[PDB]
From a paper:
The addition of [name] to the sample resulted in the formation of a stable and uniform [name]-[name]-3ʹETSleuZ ternary complex, which yielded distinct particles on cryo-EM grids. The best class was refined to an overall resolution of 3.8 Å, ranging from 3.2 Å in the [name] core to 4.4–7.2 Å in the [name] binding region. The 3ʹETSleuZ is engaged extensively with [name], interacting with the distal and proximal surfaces, and also the circumferential rim. Indeed, the 3ʹ end of the 3ʹETSleuZ RNA, marked by a poly-U sequence, is bound to the [name] proximal face. A short, exposed hairpin threads into the KH-S1 portal, where it is mainly bound by basic loops extending from two [name] S1 domains (identified as S1-3/S1-loop3 and S1-2/S1-loop2). The third S1 domain (labeled S1-1) extensively coordinates an A-rich region of the 3ʹETSleuZ RNA bound to the [name] distal side (S1-1 and S1-loop1) and is the best resolved S1 domain in the cryo-EM map. Only three complete ARN triplets could be modeled into the density, yielding an interacting sequence pattern 5ʹ RN ARN ARN ARN RNN NR 3ʹ. Interestingly, in the RNA carrier mode of [name] the KH and S1 domains adopt an open conformation that more closely resembles the conformation of the apo state rather than the substrate-bound state.
[name] ([name]) is an ancient exoribonuclease conserved in the course of evolution and is found in species as diverse as bacteria and humans. Although [name] can catalyze the polymerization of nucleotides, its main cellular function is the 3ʹ-to-5ʹ degradation of RNA (Grunberg-Manago et al., 1955). While the catalytic core performs the phosphorolytic action, the KH and S1 domains participate in RNA substrate capture and autoregulation (Wong et al., 2013) and are powerful facilitators of [name] activity. Cryoelectron microscopy (cryo-EM) was used to solve structures for E. coli [name] in the apo- and substrate-bound forms and in a ternary complex with sRNA substrate and [name] (i.e., the RNA carrier complex).
Residue numbers in the entry:
A (entry chain N): 1 to 689
B (entry chain O): 1 to 695
Write the structure that this text describes.
């Protein structure tokens, strides 16, 4: 028989179970993690040998939300689970971000971790469960890994931190901050936040890091009980028996070259010293093969810039450590789009557009927790010419979707709630050119494009991409980092939010010994640079324009009395069908208390108002008035006062006298006095000659 | 700061704007182009050095219609733009065809030009805006390129030409010709026409070329103001001693080999002397192989055939200049299909099929220009076995769409109007074998398959793929060119139309000096070959068949009153769903009471008529049942005229107050028949003792 090893927790008043040892025995390791009636099966396979022509490390992650886990049949025509959506692909990225730095330097063997959701109760989100499982599975396997990461989701409600909140706490919460870290340090931070201050969110991360300690302790128990024999993988030695000679021949001139002011002359001189030292040392294989020699020269370049940045003022572009690049910000740039903007920051440029739509058009996405409507849609397009090089159109990847979601979190915090503004809005960003941190340039552009469209957005929103360099006790916090300056980042972090408070924070710490002391001054420097940007944006547009641009659809609403419903509906929706086809306009959106008119243009809304007021309780008459002869017989006449239908006036009303014959009223089209003058009564007219 | 550079020529009665230097500054060039307000952002990136040992030119073009440009959010479930589409990959082909020949010979650096539509006004089509933008972007970049190209769309209304017509001007027009050219020559022409004559179509191309020199002038002043420096490209020399030496060792016998009458012996002898010279001739610029020597032999082969064709009548097929391949035609080839044909023309063959459908099966086409729902659908399938090769069936090439649209333009003109013929018709063509033009063979087959399915088309249509070879004052028009006469096609052109006139025209010119005198004699030779083909097509079948084939859906209508309409529906069309599935018959509700009915045969439709009348008729009439029924009670009785269900009746209206007792019979199971009396309180049911439709 087979037997399973089982451990239990109490993690934020939930009972986590790490079952292992009875499933997928051919895989390098496997665990089923369940937290509360919610379970993910996660399994690692890592081959022992990689083809010696492999330079990069192929860690790969897949996360799959099998719909049977929610106990219901798929909605797709093929009745089968489809491609990864936003939802699967973003969760695959959050699991990958903490695991990739923990693997040892120069580890290159191919590793694949596959996480399947197999149960859910709607109250508990599976992503945090999958993160615990991935660190358990990797640390149970023999594979070289620097200790198991925990994970915590932290909510903020009634000025109190709440560990691993349910959907019921999160709908009320002002914060959704996720932490992942080892025993020693935070490794990843991610959040949406309702304009909290810096010291509130740096409280949230350290609370989240303290609470996840139980998970890291329990995984260390399970690894003692059921852990495989460890791998003996060792790296190739650092020197490769040429390090010192090439360092001596390159470094003197190469370290000089970065003093040169002109980007072109600097690049040229660096290429000259590189090509000369490549041409000089052609004595052997792996010099006649440039690759190993060139990889060493590229490493010298990184070392010389890194040392300059710590002590000396000049950067890769000669700016001061904190000197943000120049801005200019055009608005209303595109002729027929609802609102549009062209935000720039050095050589990163983000053309952004906002587009407005009716209650019909909104996205109804289906996910394991629930099928649900939302009304703010953000799409991020990154075409290849943006980086000055050619390839396949679109070029879609996890990073481009990551950047889309991060930007949406930044400005979703500051969107109006539906009662102030009833439209669905799509914001769509074309990255016309990029050389670093294009995601934070896209949130600045979205803030412009919404104000320019005349959405009642609460406040202007901006973002900055920072970094930090550290050596022992020495560190420098730098602002507006380039793509070329990525090597200097021991802590890549992005902050976006209004003057009042921050909308989003994201951090990829790559190294041990970052502290609550350091993160305080780093956020305090980001506050400065972010308030500088808003100083320019407030001059380019000052407040959202009162009136929505002329090409947008219009939605508006009027209050109605409880008796008017039968008049608005008619018989089997006949008056609705007539009104909608007269007006080319949908009106069904409300029918109790109010009616809502959702029109393709302003004239069609006015046309709808005219027609509904000519029908809805317009038939009733209380005083003496005129309305024409419309259709006639001997027995009486049909007489029109308005748009709403009017029945036969009997000839005994029409004629006072005995005769009652059609000769008295034979003339068609005649204008005549007509007052119903009748309450608590069926439809009648007291016209009398 | 950034500073955009603008210019604003007047062209087509609209205001145009060439705005540059503000966006995508990392890209080799970029332009925002805007006419009226239908703006496209178009940018080119071309790498400075070509990857080693390349042979073909990897120019790539793609064009993307972002939906936000029309001011609406996407209707897709993902609420975002996905893959390219029929209406965009075709437009990319229209941008590519005039650009591709205009690059210098031996240029093989990778170039990518990408056009995004960013605003649209529904009256002005963005495609012509993209063509002037692509010309501007390439000529502003340092890329070696033989000057700018303009593009013009020409309409015909009241016997007068109109430049750049609106959608309003176009819907009334008998023509939709697009022409693109430099100041020298009309590099591309592409056109649907409502049976215009030769003089009218060749007038349209010269008009459209005269009044677009303004675009090429304004691009030239912008290139002086804002153009980057022309970067240096030099052609790889190909003029070694071994070129002349291999020619000397090949041309004489290659001339001797091309004299051979038999196709098979010709191919055999050419392959032999190729194989011999590949095996023998040393001093190749690499260890001895095909990799230049075969490409040099291929140049001799091209020169020999081309010179023979200019000097004298003989070709590779053994036919003369004005000659057409052998034809065979047969019709009704596929059973259980509404109509089918097998048009054949030497080694080119198309199994064309027509199928009819309802107004409901019509495909809605969504564009930036608004919805463009249509009723004649053309699909073009080119499987790999058609050319005697293998692999990757069913994944379409850009030219499977390209050829499909050209064929649709050819047969769109002769389709009947909706009131004379109400069915939506899909024409599908399988190219069963091809070594010649497959698109013009598909038009010939489509006109057969529509007549065979009995669609009341105006006239039979055919098409021809001409070619022209030119050498100084020498030129020859070839009336029907194969798949390996490609090197002889300096002017590649395809024309399809009725006896009366042209329905579609397409020309790719890739030589200078094409005068109107040349284009007249070329079209006049196409007229000859096209009338020959109709001579065979008319002899296989004369006119559309008396009515549609017995399997085809026959649609008809009966008028019934609105109280029966609600009774045919029930709730949520549930009675329609039941009756339509029971009868296998389609129906449509209309508010005037004329319900439409469609089935594959008469009897199924008649069954549906009978059932909806019988079910929605009042209960007063019906079958003459013996009303023996149980469940009789003193305080009202349940009585069924028919069926298991038992309806109610009461002490008074059982027997029109003739008695005080509930039933005069006063007996359960008694035989007296029952039918409804009209009176019906909503909370009451009436089923009186009534025989023989007493009512």
């Amino acid at each position: 028989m087979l037997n399973p090893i089982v451990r239990k927790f109490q993690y934020g008043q939930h009972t986590v179970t790490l079952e292992t040892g009875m499933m997928a025995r051919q895989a390098t390791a496997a665990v089923m993690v369940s937290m509360d009636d919610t379970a993910v099966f996660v399994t690692v396979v890592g081959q022992k040998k990689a083809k010696p022509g492999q330079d990069f490390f192929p860690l790969t992650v897949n996360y799959q939300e099998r719909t049977y886990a929610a106990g219901r049949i798929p909605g797709s025509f093929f009745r089968r689970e489809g491609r990864p959506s936003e939802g699967e692909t973003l969760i695959a990225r959050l699991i990958d971000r903490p695991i990739r730095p923990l693997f040892p330097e120069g580890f290159v063997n191919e590793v694949q971790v596959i996480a399947t959701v197999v149960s859910v109760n709607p109250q508990v989100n599976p992503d945090i469960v999958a993160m615990i499982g991935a660190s358990a599975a990797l640390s149970l396997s023999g594979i070289p890994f620097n200790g198991p990461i925990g994970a915590a989701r932290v909510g903020y409600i009634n000025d109190q931190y709440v560990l691993n909140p349910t959907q019921d706490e999160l709908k009320e919460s002002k914060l959704d901050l996720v932490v992942a870290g080892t025993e020693a340090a935070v490794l990843m931070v991610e959040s949406e936040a309702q304009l909290l201050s810096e010291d509130q969110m740096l409280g949230a991360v350290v609370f989240g890091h303290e609470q996840q300690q139980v998970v890291i302790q329990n995984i260390n128990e399970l690894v003692k009980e059921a852990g495989k024999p460890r791998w003996d993988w060792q790296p190739e030695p650092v020197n490769e028996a040429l390090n010192a000679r090439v360092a001596a021949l390159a470094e003197a001139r190469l370290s000089d070259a970065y003093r040169i002011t002109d980007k072109q002359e600097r690049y040229a001189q660096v290429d000259v010293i590189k090509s000369e030292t490549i041409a000089t040392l052609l004595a052997e294989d792996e010099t006649l093969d440039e690759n190993e020699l060139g990889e060493i020269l590229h490493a010298i370049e990184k070392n010389v810039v890194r040392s300059r940045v710590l002590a000396g003022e000049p950067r890769i572009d000669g700016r001061e450590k904190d000197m943000i690049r120049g801005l200019d910000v055009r608005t209303g740039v595109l002729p027929r789009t609802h609102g549009s903007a062209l935000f720039t920051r050095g050589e990163t440029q983000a053309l952004v557009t906002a587009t407005l739509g009716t209650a019909r058009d909104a996205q109804v996405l289906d996910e394991l927790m629930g099928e649900r409507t939302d009304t703010f849609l953000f799409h991020y397009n990154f075409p290849p010419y943006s980086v000055g090089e050619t390839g396949m159109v679109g070029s879609p990847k996890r990073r481009e979707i990551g950047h889309g979601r991060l930007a949406k979190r930044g400005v979703l915090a500051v969107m109006p709630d539906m009662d102030k503004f009833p439209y669905t809005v799509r914001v769509v960003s074309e990255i016309t050119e990029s050389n670093g941190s294009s995601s934070m340039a896209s949130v600045c552009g979205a803030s412009l494009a919404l104000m320019d469209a005349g959405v009642p957005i609460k406040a202007a929103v901006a973002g900055i991409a920072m970094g930090l360099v550290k050596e022992g006790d020495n560190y420098v916090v730098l602002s507006d980092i380039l793509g070329d300056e990525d090597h200097l980042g021991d802590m890549d972090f992005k902050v976006a939010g209004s003057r009042d408070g921050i909308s989003a924070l994201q951090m990829d710490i790559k190294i041990e010994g970052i502290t609550k002391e350091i993160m305080q001054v780093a956020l305090n420097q980001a506050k400065g640079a972010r308030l500088h940007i808003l100083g320019v944006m407030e001059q380019a547009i000052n407040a959202p324009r009162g009136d929505i641009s002329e090409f947008a659809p219009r939605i508006h609403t009027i209050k109605i009395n409880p008796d008017k419903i039968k008049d608005v509906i008619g018989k089997g929706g006949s008056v609705i069908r007539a009104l909608t086809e007269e007006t080319g306009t949908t009106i069904e959106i409300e029918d109790d208390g109010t009616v809502k008119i959702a029109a393709t243009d302003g004239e069609k809304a006015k046309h709808a108002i005219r027609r509904i007021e000519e029908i809805t309780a317009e038939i009733e008459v209380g005083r003496v008035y005129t309305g024409k002869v419309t259709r006639i017989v001997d027995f009486g006449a049909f007489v029109a006062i308005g748009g709403g239908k009017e029945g036969l006036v009997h000839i005994s009303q029409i004629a006072d006298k005995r005769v009652e014959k059609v000769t008295d009223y034979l003339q068609m089209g005649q204008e005549v006095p007509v007052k119903v003058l009748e309450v608590d009564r069926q439809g009648r007219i007291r016209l009398s000659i």
